[PDB]
Structures are given as C-alpha cells and as structure tokens.
C-alpha cells in the first residue's frame, strides 16, 4: 500500500530545498544516510524512487528484472529523441530495436577478429598522429575522440572519417558539449524544470542546437545510403536497418521506420564515441597522478607483448595488472553516477513498498561502484581493488559501470575491447608527462550530473 519514505516535497518544485544541482549525486547520497538505501525524491514534479548500494540495485534490476525494465526520462536527450530509438524507448519499441542492434553488431564482427583488426589498425593511426606531435604539450581530447569515433563509425557509416575532415571535428564538438551540459547544475536543474526551461534562453539551447546538428548529419548519411543500397549486401548498420525496413513495410505496427533508424544510429554513434573517449581521458590523468602504477603496466606490457608485435585482445589473460587498472579507472571514473533512469512497467511490490505503474527509478550505479562492502577504499584510486594477494585478477559483483539487468550496456563487448587495446598500444609506445606535478594534479571531477566529466588538462607524448 505505500511509497518508500523520503523528505516532504513542495508543490511543483518537489524536493528542491534538499537538492544541490551542482552535486545531485552527493545530494541523493546525503538523503540516503537519513532515509535508507530505498527512498522517494521529487525532482520537480517527477516522482522518483532512488536505489543505493549493491543490494537494492541488484534486487531491483536483476531479481525483479522484468518489472524494472522500463525507461525513465533524461530530459535533455528526450527533447530530441522524444521516445524514439533504442536508448530512450520503452515496451515493445525498445525490445525490438535492442534485439535488432545486438544481432547486427554481432554480424559486423563485434567481439570477434574483424573488429579487433579494425581497432588495431585505427590504433596505429593514433600512434602515428601522437608521434606527429614530437612530444609537444597538447590537449589529448580530440586525439582520443577521433580514434574512438572511427571504430563505431566504420560499423554505423561503413568507413572511417578522415582525421583532417572539418565536419568530423564539428560533430565531435557537438557530442562533447551536449554530453557535458547534462553534467552541469543548469543541466540538472533542466531535469526538474524542463517544461518551463525549454522555452527559456540559456546553456540548454546550445545543447539542443548540437543535438539537432547531430540529427541533421545522420539524416543526410541515410538519404545517401538509401540510393546505393544493395539489399543482399549491407555496407553498414544503416544498410542493415534499411533492409529490415523493406522486409517489414507490410506490417503496420513495425518499429522499423525512418525515425527509429535515425535515432538508433545516433544512439550508437553518440554512446560509442563519448563513453570510451571520456574514460580514456580520465584514465590518462589518473595514471599521471599515479606514476608508480604507470611503471607496472609498462613492465607488464614489455614482457607479455614487446616492442615488436601489435597488442591483441586475448593478450589480457596473461596481463592481470593491466586489467585491474582498466577496471579501477572505470570504477573511479564512474561514467554515469545515477545510471540511465529506469521506470516500472506495472504496479510493483518491492521490499515492503508499493510502486505505482509509471514510477521513475534511479539506480545509483555510482553507489555500487563505491559500496564499502565491495571495495576497501572506495574514494581512492587503487588497482589492488581488482587483484588477489597472488596478483591474479579478481572480479567484483559491484563492478557495474555498464549497469545490469534487462537494459544492460550491449556496447560492453566493444567498449572493453577498445578500452583494452587502446590503453595498451598507447602505453607500449608512449609514457606520459604533464606540465604539472603528480601531487598537484586534480583528479576530482569537473562536473557531476548525468555524467562524470574530468577536468581540462594537457600532457605530452614521449616515445619508448
Ligand atoms: C565507457 C564505456 C561505456 C559505459 C560506462 C556505458 C554504460 C552504459 C550504461 C550505464 C547504460 C544504461 C543501462 C541501463 O539503462 O541500465 C548504457 C546503455 C547503452 N549503451 Fe553503453 N556504455 C559504454 C559504452 C557503450 C558503447 C561503445 C556503445 C556502442 C554500441 C554503447 C551503447 C549503448 C546503448 C544503445 C545503450 C542503451 C541500451 C538500452 O536502453 O537498452 N555504450 N551504457
Ligand atoms: C552515453 N550513453 C550510454 C547510455 C545512453 C547513451 C546515450 C546518451 C545520450 C545520447 N545518446 C546515447
């Protein structure tokens, strides 16, 4: 008969007086200390059930998986996507788009050799580019995102972008500004009060324009692809989707139409660019702050692999310390703190509470990555979190940065391959120094909201 407890809201504003839009994660955690790991919060007029720590999140998303498999709102992205595409759909749409995308991703070689060689080759152009700097002092931002983007772009668009291409650069700028915006106070305030704020001047309009620009681009590529489409041989993800469109025109409740094509392709391009990009970014800063951890990775690379051969994905099994470090980077980086919002499909019973149909659910993925029962020093950067006393790699059940449950990151295979081979080919060739001193490096997040954004920095790439 009852909603979980939480602080008393006010009309329209909800729990505004208890939330700090600069630090929403620290706000919900603070309310947690008082109310328990399972509480109700009103983000303006939206009613939201928050789940903190491993047990509550798992119990929701794994044990009652089917009830918690809907999608709640992320307002900024909703403005553009409007319930279309894979990421921000629900019900029958998501289930259909999700299964298409997974099967197609498998068909383009994901988690197999075709994509390994494409990443290996693409990692080559990155080294080359990084040498083309001659150890000068640079922003690594768009060096990483150009290399990262090209992997998913081979798959969605059919071929890589050229690095000098001015439109490519413009797209990666759109992506980074959009994403960043969601991590700002204004972006979080935008989560409570969007119905008024969408009609107002400020940083949000900029975000809309970048998203529109990204939509403008995919929508053009598609018109192109439609006219040289060869139905028995797809060049790309766009082709595959267009073929499925034909096969299904005689079904009027099909999910396969133009609008879901544009939006899903956008999902992949955006998610397959900015996540790995940002994680590599954060990860570089972390290693520079911790140069002792940097040397053991080097040591372990020089012995399983060498100077000679390109690193390959299966090289990880014999490289326990490097895998611990990659996990610890993802663990500390905390890409999305509050996950993507969930919602219950139906009236649901959960631990003595009742959630009416339609209730938004925040599973706080950041609080699982920081759960004290699973990690000895949660707020520190410490590879030993993923190693035994033997130095073998150890799994954690709270390593959930890709989430869990019905709506899990189906990009996981790809990201993990990319994360591994990109971290490893770069450090094979380079060691990192910064203009700044290891004890003076700020590894605290620049922005925390929907995403976790590392501070702006510069570094140099010096050969080995
Ligand atoms: C640093 C790497 C990445 C992280 C930390 C990450 C994390 C996540 C998270 C937390 C979700 C939400 C899951 C949920 O709602 O419970 C998600 C979903 C999703 N991700 Fe990733 N991801 C990463 C890489 C990628 C890549 C490379 C792709 C490209 C194919 C991708 C595509 C997607 C899509 C389409 C969804 C929506 C799935 C759905 O709604 O059912 N992600 N990811
Ligand atoms: C970054 N992402 C991982 C989960 C959703 C996905 C995303 C976010 C915004 C726009 N498109 C895709």
From Swiss-Prot:
GO terms for molecular function: arachidonate epoxygenase activity; coumarin 7-hydroxylase activity; heme binding; iron ion binding; monooxygenase activity; oxidoreductase activity, acting on paired donors, with incorporation or reduction of molecular oxygen, reduced flavin or flavoprotein as one donor, and incorporation of one atom of oxygen. It is a peripheral membrane protein. Changing residue 335 to V: Decreases phenacetin O-deethylation activity 7 fold. The keyword Ribonucleoprotein does not apply. It comes from the Eukaryota. The keyword Isomerase does not apply. GO terms for biological process: aflatoxin metabolic process; coumarin metabolic process; epoxygenase P450 pathway; xenobiotic metabolic process. Changing residue 423 to Y: In allele CYP2A13*5. Its EC number is 1.14.14.1. InterPro entries: Cyt_P450, Cyt_P450_CS, Cyt_P450_E_grp-I, Cyt_P450_E_grp-I_CYP2A-like, Cyt_P450_sf, Cytochrome_P450_fam2. It is found in: Endoplasmic reticulum membrane; Microsome membrane. It is an enzyme of class 1 (oxidoreductase). Substrate binds at residue 267. This is Cytochrome P450 2A13. It comes from Homo sapiens (Human).
């Amino acid at each position: 008969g009852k909603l979980p407890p939480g602080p008393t809201p006010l009309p329209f504003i909800g729990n505004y007086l208890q939330l700090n839009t600069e630090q929403m994660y620290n706000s919900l955690m603070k309310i947690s200390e008082r109310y328990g790991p399972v509480f109700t919060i009103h983000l303006g007029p939206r009613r939201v059930v928050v789940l903190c720590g491993h047990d509550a999140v798992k119990e929701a998303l794994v044990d009652q998986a089917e009830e918690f498999s809907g999608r709640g709102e992320q307002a900024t992205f909703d403005w553009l996507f409007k319930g279309y595409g894979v990421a921000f759909s629900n019900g029958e749409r998501a289930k259909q788009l999700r299964r298409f995308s997974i099967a197609t991703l498998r068909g383009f070689g994901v988690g197999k050799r075709g994509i390994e060689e494409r990443i290996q080759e693409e990692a080559g152009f990155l080294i080359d580019a990084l040498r083309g700097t001659h150890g000068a002092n640079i922003d690594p931002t768009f060096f990483l995102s150009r290399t990262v983007s090209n992997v998913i772009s081979s798959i969605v668009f059919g071929d890589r972008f050229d690095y000098e291409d001015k439109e490519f650069l413009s797209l990666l700028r759109m992506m980074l500004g959009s994403f960043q915006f969601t991590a700002t106070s204004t972006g979080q305030l935008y989560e409570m009060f969007s119905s008024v704020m969408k009609h107002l001047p400020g940083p949000q309009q900029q975000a809309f324009k970048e998203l529109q620009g990204l939509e403008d681009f995919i929508a053009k590529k598609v018109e192109h692809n439609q006219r040289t489409l060869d139905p028995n041989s797809p060049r790309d993800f766009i082709d595959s989707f267009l073929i499925r469109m034909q096969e299904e025109e005689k079904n009027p409740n099909t999910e396969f139409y133009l609008k879901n094509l544009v939006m899903t392709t956008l999902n992949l391009f955006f998610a397959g660019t900015e996540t790995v990009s940002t994680t590599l970014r954060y990860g570089f800063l972390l290693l520079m702050k911790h140069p002792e951890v940097e040397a053991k990775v080097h040591e372990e690379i020089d012995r399983v692999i060498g100077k000679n051969r390109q690193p390959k994905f299966e090289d990880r099994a014999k490289m326990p310390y490097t895998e611990a470090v990659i996990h610890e980077i993802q663990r500390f980086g905390d890409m999305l703190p509050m996950g993507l919002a969930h919602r219950v499909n139906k009236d649901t019973k959960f631990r003595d509470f009742f959630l009416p149909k339609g209730t938004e659910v925040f599973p706080m993925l950041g609080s699982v990555l920081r759960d004290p029962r699973f990690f000895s020093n949660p707020r520190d950067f410490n590879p030993q979190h993923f190693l035994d006393k033997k130095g073998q790699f150890k799994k954690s059940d709270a390593f959930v940065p890709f989430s869990i449950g019905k709506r899990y990151c189906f990009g996981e295979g790809l990201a993990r391959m990319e994360l591994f081979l990109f971290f490893t080919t770069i450090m094979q060739n380079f060691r990192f120094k910064s203009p700044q001193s290891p004890k003076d490096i700020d590894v605290s997040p620049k922005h925390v909201g929907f995403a976790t954004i590392p501070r702006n920095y510069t570094m140099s790439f010096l050969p080995r």
